[PDB]
Amino acid sequence: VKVAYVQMNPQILEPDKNYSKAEKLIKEASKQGAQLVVLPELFDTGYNFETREEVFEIAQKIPEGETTTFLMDVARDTGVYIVAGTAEKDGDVLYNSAVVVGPRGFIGKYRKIHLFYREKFFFEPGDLGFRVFDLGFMKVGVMICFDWFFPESARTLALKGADVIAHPANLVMPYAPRAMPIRALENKVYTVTADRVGEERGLKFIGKSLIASPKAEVLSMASETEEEVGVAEIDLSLVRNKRINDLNDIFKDRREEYYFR
Amino acid sequence: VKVAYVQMNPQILEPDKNYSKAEKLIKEASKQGAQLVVLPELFDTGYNFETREEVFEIAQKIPEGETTTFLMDVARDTGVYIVAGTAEKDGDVLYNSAVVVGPRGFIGKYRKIHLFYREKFFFEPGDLGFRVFDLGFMKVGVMICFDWFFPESARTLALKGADVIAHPANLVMPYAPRAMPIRALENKVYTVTADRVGEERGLKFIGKSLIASPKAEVLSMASETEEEVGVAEIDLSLVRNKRINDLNDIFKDRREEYYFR
Ligand SMILES: [Mg+2]
């Protein structure tokens, strides 16, 4: 299996422009043999809003709306599964979500559980929990951006059977790229952090999209500033066997009775 | 406030020799200003036992045994607090323990919750939970070796108000030195990993003792091979206030409803 990130530079409040850029890059990930392609957080809308009104205006329902139906169309055409960050309109409320689509259609969604900084003024805290989606050939867990900061995000997805954690991000702190391989190691999963690049109303994002292995190896890493795709080969038996030596299994050894109490 | 690790090379089954080495190094640390000094896991007995009988023969009681007695004397005489790893005899049972001793005497013990590899043939799994010890001027959490691998260990300690996690270790894998700064960051806590060095019945330990900070900065780090002390100044404001920005407080932001389920 090959997995891929798409590191792009979303244009704030311009979904058509972002649909165009994303298709172009998903097509190149597909040309490169990717079977699963991960896009950044909020790829359709951009990130740095001044008011909720400008995002609410453009934000789409899932699965009914344009971004899901767009991504279905690209999945169908390219034969890839896609995890993508999107602003989700749900009645009068907005979430910071990721959609999972396949060539056969919509698979499901995740709503960001740990909101970061000014996201608290715009978005409602995610309310679907940490979900894992079975694509047949692999189980894919989804978390978004600041979810990386809490070890419980990746751990919950790993317990739930994720082979790979798809991680749409709009990273601003320098830490996540160094921390991601530790997340991968401690759960014995692959992690695919699709970061954005660019500068948006004074806010500069760090890029450095990366794929990490269960041995904390960095299989692919992106620049700080360029749009690009990164594809890495993954070993599905290297993750599904939680043995770390012949006497320890990382899930058998956890002792939940002593945690957080 | 200054904290330290003592990185040393325990001689297997030679507690006299190890007490003597510990005393020289604790005093080097005490001279350099350290108020808290952390020693390696099983510093008195050594690690690489072939039979339970050989460690049972020499393993000491806590607090009345020779190791705790030794440590109380050193701490009475240096004015320091000491966290040290020690094989604990408790009746007819053995624990892989850490003791905390101050100038007053014995403050308390921690029993290693996550046993590693062959340890399960000698020791019982720890049964006192993850404990935080109030020294007045600081709260010290304690975990041992492989406890690092489970994010839940440091997280339990940090939630219980630990300002610093004292971490006696005998590392053989290379990952802990790379992970500890992420444990420090994700909990906004200081961590003190006191590793051993040496080769013990052919098993090589990796040294690389380190002190990490709440910003993922490594403040002090030791060699692969040499016996040494490392001392660093810690800022308690930087741990106690869990705010990473005006809108995010890492403990208020945890959403336990979605963790591990
Ligand atoms: Mg050094």
Residues from chain A contacting residue B117 (CB–CB below 8 Å): 245, 247-248
DSSP letter assigned to residue A243: B
CA-nearest residue to B118 within chain A is: A247
Annotated binding residues of A for substrate, written as ranges, equal: 172-173
Q: Are B111 and B101 in contact (CB under 8 A)?
A: no
User: Going by DSSP bridges, is the β-strand pair A164-168/A139-142 parallel, antiparallel, or unpaired?
Assistant: parallel
Q: Residue A143: name the closest of A161, A122, A164, A123 by CA.
A: A164
CA-nearest residue to B147 within chain A is: A254
Q: What are phi and psi of A62, to 5 degrees?
A: -120, 125
What's the gap in Å between the CA of A233 and the closest CA on chain B? 23
What fold is seen in the domain A1-261?
Nitrilase/N-carbamoyl-D-aminoacid amidohydrolase (3.60.110)
Q: Residue B43: name the closest of B82, B90, B4, B92 by CA.
A: B82
Please list, in sequence order, all residues whose beta carbon lies within 8 angstroms of the beta carbon of residue A218, skipping any fewer than 6 positions away: A181, A210, A211, A212
Inter-helix orientation angle B151-159/B176-187, to 10°: 30
Binary contact (A258, B150; C-beta < 8 A): no
Count Cα atoms within 13 angstroms, Cβ side, for A258. 23
Cis-peptide, bond into residue A214, ω within 30° of zero: no
Ramachandran class of B13: left when φ > 0, alpha when ψ lies in -120 to 50, beta otherwise: left
The residue ranges of every structural domain in chain B are 1-261
How was this structure determined? It was done by X-ray
A66, two tokens: 């344009």
